[model samples]
Target: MSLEGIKQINFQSINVVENLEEAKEGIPTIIMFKTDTCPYCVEMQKELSYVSKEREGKFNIYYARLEEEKNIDLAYKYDANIVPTTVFLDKEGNKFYVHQGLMRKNNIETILNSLGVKEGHHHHHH
Candidate 1:
């Protein structure tokens, strides 16, 4: 029940970014459309954050807030009528895996595995 392999991602690269060539690399991309006031969104965000950190080098992850002007267009673009919409994007920015609402560790890892991202040995030198 862990994202032991994967790789690296720049989650902080953008808070409300769209159509950025840099974000669309060959790796799996995780885009979360959320809002501040939604309870579900907050909870989902926590799940996503844990996955992002555990699988830091595994994929590209973004947590976009719909309340922010920078993310309105993206929220609309994705047709995210409901809050806490998590979508996995291909390298070309197309929808890969669309999961609505909150996802647990197993759920998230399942998606990653489905995309051919397996766990690898991570060696940290002290």
Candidate 2:
């Protein structure tokens, strides 16, 4: 699984993340709330990273760490009492799906498919 695309997010005193949708146009958004010490969080993050690379440019996945002071309030707002809480946002930024604990890659793919995310066709050059 490719792990290079994981990006940290800050939701404090913020309303809309304008760049999230605008950067990718119609792509949905994924925010996984996790902590460093949680093994399940690591596993979930790995799965998300794999999905991110497999469906490259199809969506975005952001990480919110509970160990970070900046993410405390956001975690509380989302009731992410459990580690590896994943939140899915539609094109309009509405929280359409929420899942707790670790999710299998196929399960994640199912959600993405339901969200209208398609498999990108890449033409191999060179």
Candidate 3:
């Protein structure tokens, strides 16, 4: 499916991971914690679609559905108590930023920039 003209790589279609080792395959790992019933989560999902499409291959996008037991465990482990929480991690899984709640496209882009990711430089696939 797609949002805001940006395609979303489904968790079922793509590799959904839980461990840091698996996530470390990509340099910058972006993990989003969301729930199906949350309105903010829905909006963030749309924003994530745009980011994913724009970045293409610069980072690994992982979706953590908080409703699931395993995902919920991970959420608690990361101390993500709110829905639509987005965490940016370095290659070693170090959390650079953790944003909870809906964020504007520009804000999200700025966060990515803060992590040393340039617009055009993100063109590689994971």
Candidate 4:
């Protein structure tokens, strides 16, 4: 499902893990830690969307909500001590990179590109 008011790159939300025992499906994942009111999160979401678009159809993101997600415990297992902490995960669901701040689109794309995400079609943004 797409994040409301956020652009879609075919991201899926993993709520409660459902079955934590499941193995990695080989799809790169991004688990974002955010809250609705945080300013940094609002800014970060913009870049996240850009990267999502730029990746074409190569990656998936989970917009983890501290309050709305199905399992608060699972959310706690990941870091939520701060707003806008992005945990980029491998297919195994382990941390590939943990970014915690406002990031420029170019820099974000650089990191993503290194992780094997495909390039986008254009550079235009509103």
Report every candidate's CA lDDT. 0.60, 0.61, 0.64, 0.55
Predicted structure with the largest TM-score when compared to the true one: 3
List model 2 lDDT by residue over 1-126, tens digit each: 223344323222122132332234345666678776777855665666566555655666656667667667767766677778887766544577788878887898788777664333342342
Q: Which tens-of-lDDT digit does each residue in 1-126 have in candidate 1? A: 123334323333322233343354555566777776677755655566676556656566666667577577777676666767777665445676777777786797678767654322232443
**Ranking of candidates on lDDT, top first:** 3, 2, 1, 4
Off by over 4 Å in 1: 1-24, 117-126
Residue-wise C-alpha lDDT for candidate 3, range 2-107, written one tens digit per residue: 4433344353223334444356454566777877567775566567667665665566667777667777677876668787778877654567899887787578
Candidate 4 has what TM-score? 0.61
Q: Which stretches of candidate 4 lie above 4 Å from their native place?
A: 1-24, 69-71, 117-126
- Candidate 3 clashing pairs, residues 3+ apart or interchain: 57-124
Q: Per-residue CA lDDT of candidate 4, range 1-126, in tens?
A: 436544442343221121233323455556666665676755656666676555554555665656664426655666555666666665555666777666776886676555654332233444
Candidate 3 off by > 4 Å: 2-24, 117-126
* lDDT, model 4, position 104: 72
User: Ten consecutive residues with minimal summed lDDT in candidate 1?
Assistant: 8-17
Tell me model 3's lDDT, rounded to 2 decimals: 0.64
**What is the Å distance of residue 1 in model 4 from its true position?**
14
**Model 2 spans > 4 angstroms off:** 1-26, 118-126
